[PDB]
């Protein structure tokens, strides 16, 4: 059973966003399991599962803890506006390939 801890929750009205640091705790598990972590984050906060996102995962030595960077949006459309395209390729729906020449 994974365990979740949010810390230092601030609000960004300019980016319509709420951001925090994510202490993810998995004793006798491998690692963070980021999609399941987005599920757990989207249910501890409000619904917006295609508007919650995590990117900066570092597991400490020997496992157990990992610190990530969590940012949760309202309004999935403006989340699609404000998130970068590589994270949208990683998690959500966007896929535009670069033209392979030279």
């Amino acid at each position: 059973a994974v365990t979740i801890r949010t810390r230092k929750v601030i609000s960004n009205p300019l980016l319509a966003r709420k951001q925090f640091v994510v202490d993810v705790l998995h004793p006798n598990r491998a690692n963070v399991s980021k999609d399941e972590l987005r599920e757990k984050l989207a249910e501890v906060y409000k619904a917006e599962k295609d508007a919650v996102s995590v990117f900066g995962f570092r597991t400490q030595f020997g496992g157990g803890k990992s610190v990530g960077f969590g940012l949760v949006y309202n309004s999935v459309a403006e989340a699609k506006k404000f998130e970068p395209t590589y994270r949208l390729v990683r998690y959500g729906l966007a896929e535009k390939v670069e033209k392979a020449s030279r």
Partner: protein, 454 residues
């Protein structure tokens, strides 16, 4: 003078480091971080709460309604209580039984509701340290802890298990073993208004759990003897005390760092301090804690000390040397075996082998001005801490509790200026860890409740 030169050179050093009040006094980085402080959320859990309940001299002391409800369980060990924002209490014994009480009928003795008794039936069929997932206690339940929300009680003892029982039925919902051979739990404390438990296990270890997720958060290491007591408040700090290493540590649990506080009273300098014009001495083992607020706490020792410690001083702020008396010396008909009283008196060596009572229970009411100490002197003591927070002082005594006090905690009633509390104290005739206790002087295994007023 070498220490004078050390102090002088350290002062010059700090002056030089400063080298490398006006009308304008504003610093850009400080005010930017204060803008981020105005931007952030969650001013809820992390209150550095000071002492906001100044009521020590206010309430009455000497005429409490003291009911010592004796129960038929050998050597009660712990007491857990609960208040929402009807009140239940919990006791547990060395006879492997948990017992639920109702306590909310305030003017009278508590009411038994439900047993939950483990026994020899719950010994595991493996003797293997990770299939310890049975549903009951087979050895020596040492501590209970009620949830701050009241869905669960969680208990554990020398069978190295944490069994979490439901409140409404006293049923084991989940079993979490501590996965090693010496992993006996000795103290449990929820952080206040939460679902997070801090257990202190004799592996020099502190385990943390989230109870409603059935998960373990963090194991944190660092004491040097068994972590005999634990204490927590609404902050994610914690305060533990290991027994014989004579240090109390407090843990930033997310950072996994600590502040250590050693003791350090010596009878040489103490008897010289009295010699400038006396039966007091060094320290055995720091035993019990309770975090009074988020800047101070208090420790109960093995030589009867009660000490008051701040968050900003390694050495303690205040001591109180003898807090429950010195024990009655062993009789001349039970020391020597000679015939004459002169030689049987010579076998007492005067005052050299008088040992003090050791405080085996201490409870600070959270953020309040008053704490309660208990041992087998027969009389609980009530002390209030002065409003400048650099001393405490004995208010009164509660003399209706014959036996060892294995647990003290209080139950609140009344509003902001008019209040009444019932002090529960588990009374046994045997210390909560080993036996060690002779001269059982009229003790009974009961619950000493007192109703204090105003």
């Amino acid at each position: 003078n070498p220490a004078d030169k050390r102090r002088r050179l350290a002062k010059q050093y700090l002056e030089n480091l400063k080298s490398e009040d006006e009308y304008n006094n504003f610093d850009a980085g400080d005010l930017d971080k204060d803008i981020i402080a105005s931007r952030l959320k969650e001013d809820v859990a992390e209150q550095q709460g000071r002492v906001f309940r100044y009521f020590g001299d206010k309430l009455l002391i000497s005429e409490a309604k003291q009911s010592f409800t004796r129960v038929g369980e050998n050597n009660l060990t712990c007491i857990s209580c609960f208040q929402p924002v009807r009140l239940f209490a919990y006791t547990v014994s060395k006879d492997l039984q948990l017992t639920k009480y109702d306590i909310t009928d305030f003017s009278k003795r508590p009411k038994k509701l439900k047993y939950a008794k483990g026994g020899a039936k719950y010994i595991p069929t493996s003797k293997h340290e990770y299939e310890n997932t049975t549903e009951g206690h087979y050895d020596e339940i040492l501590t209970v802890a009620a949830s701050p929300d009241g869905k669960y009680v969680v208990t554990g003892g020398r069978d190295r298990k944490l069994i979490v029982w439901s409140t409404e039925s006293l049923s084991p919902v989940k079993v979490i073993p501590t996965k090693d051979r010496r992993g006996e739990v000795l103290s449990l404390a929820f952080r206040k208004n939460s679902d997070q438990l801090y257990a202190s296990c004799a592996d020099f270890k502190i385990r943390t759990y989230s109870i409603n997720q059935f998960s373990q958060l963090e194991i944190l290491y660092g004491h040097h003897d068994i972590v005999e007591d634990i204490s927590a408040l609404a902050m994610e700090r914690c305060v533990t005390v290991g027994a014989r290493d004579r240090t109390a540590m407090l843990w930033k649990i997310p950072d996994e760092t600590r502040l250590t506080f050693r003791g350090g009273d010596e009878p040489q300098k103490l008897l010289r301090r009295w010699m400038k014009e006396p039966l007091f001495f060094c320290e055995g083992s720091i035993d019990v804690v309770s975090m009074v607020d988020d800047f101070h706490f208090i420790t109960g020792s093995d030589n009867g000390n009660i000490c008051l410690w701040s968050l900003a001083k390694k050495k303690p702020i205040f001591t109180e040397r003898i807090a429950h008396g010195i024990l009655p010396e062993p009789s001349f008909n039970d020391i020597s075996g000679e015939t004459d009283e002169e030689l049987r008196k010579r076998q007492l060596q005067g005052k050299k082998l008088l040992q003090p009572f050791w405080i085996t229970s201490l409870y600070a009411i959270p953020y309040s001005n008053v704490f309660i100490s208990g041992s087998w002197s027969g009389s609980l003591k009530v002390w209030k801490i002065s409003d400048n927070l650099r001393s405490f002082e004995l208010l009164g005594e509660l003399s209706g509790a014959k036996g060892v006090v294995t647990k003290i905690q209080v139950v609140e009633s009344g509003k902001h200026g008019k209040e009444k509390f019932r002090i529960l104290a588990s009374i046994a005739k045997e210390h909560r860890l080993g036996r060690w206790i002779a001269n059982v002087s009229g003790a009974r295994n009961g619950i000493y409740s007192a109703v204090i007023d105003q």
